[PDB]
């Protein structure tokens, strides 16, 4: 039903690296990624802010329908078999649903929302359910237009609202993931480097044993959130970054990531080799 500010459980984490390419570096997507890899790879994830140069509809906004799934945020980590289908929406109607939910639940800052999100997942006091559009199949000249990367695997669309989540997972086939936020509220990302994958899975098996018994293949299901604070206590390196609209997040082969949204937003991501 509503916010408890004093009950906040915001993770205390190191920030993932942020990159500010120049127009020249930016002119070659694949080449730029390659160049920052040595620096960014040990973190599993990184944020890329495009230069000023870079700069990318009623019938769609109001016309194109998509379906959603329902998430019980209070059950993502602690529960005694996943995301049921939700209503169909358009961007317009989804936004209004999304905006009213936040207005009533709570203008909070990103850190306010993040502290509340983890309160709901670690120590819930009520059922909170939320809706997201994921897996929506779409729908200069540079690979930053995600539709062009498979060339030089198809782009996928994500519509989020406050507290909607993407639970811990690695990309298929040790692929990179490149994610662009088209517009809307910030998305919180938590990343673990490939070399720490074993520590992460093992921390999860240790603390959520009964969950693994009934679902031996949890780690593939995308249905389980797990606190960075718990990970941190098991010696796992978790890095945070906050993605704003107009910004990319890049995930490295074999890196685990998870996160949630601070409000209504729209993003597109693709896998790259
Ligand atoms: O954007 C989301 O909600 C989730 N995206 C991913 O997990 C992907 O970019 O690797
Ligand atoms: Fe992903």
Residue numbers in the entry: 139 to 194, 200 to 223, 262 to 287, 296 to 328, 350 to 362, 378 to 498
Sentences from the paper on this structure:
In this work we have identified a rice histone demethylase, namely JMJ703, which specifically demethylates methylated histone H3 lysine 4. Our results demonstrate that JMJ703 is essential for plant cell division and stem elongation and specifically demethylates mono-, di-, and trimethylated H3K4 in vivo and in vitro. Finally, the fragment spanning amino acids 139 to 498 (termed c-JMJ703), covering the JmjN and JmjC domains, was deemed to be suitable for crystallographic investigation.
The high resolution structure of the catalytic core of JMJ703 (c-JMJ703) in complex with cofactors and substrate peptide reveals that the overall folding of c-JMJ703 is similar to those defined in animal and yeast JMJD2 that are H3K9 and H3K36 demethylases. The final model was best at a resolution of 2.35 Å with a final Rwork value of 19.3% (Rfree = 22.5%). Three of the ten residues in the H3K4me3 peptide (ARTKme3QTARKS) were visible in the c-JMJ703-NOG-H3K4me3 complex structure. This complex structure provided a view of the substrate peptide-binding mode of an H3K4 demethylase. The methyl groups could not be defined properly in the c-JMJ703-NOG-H3K4me3 complex structure because of low occupancy as indicated by obviously higher B-factor for atoms in H3K4me3 peptide. Fe(II) also interacted with the C-1 carboxyl and C-2 oxo groups of NOG. In the crystal structure of c-JMJ703-NOG-H3K4me3, NOG formed three hydrogen bonds with the side chains of N404 and K412 similar to the JMJD2 homologues.
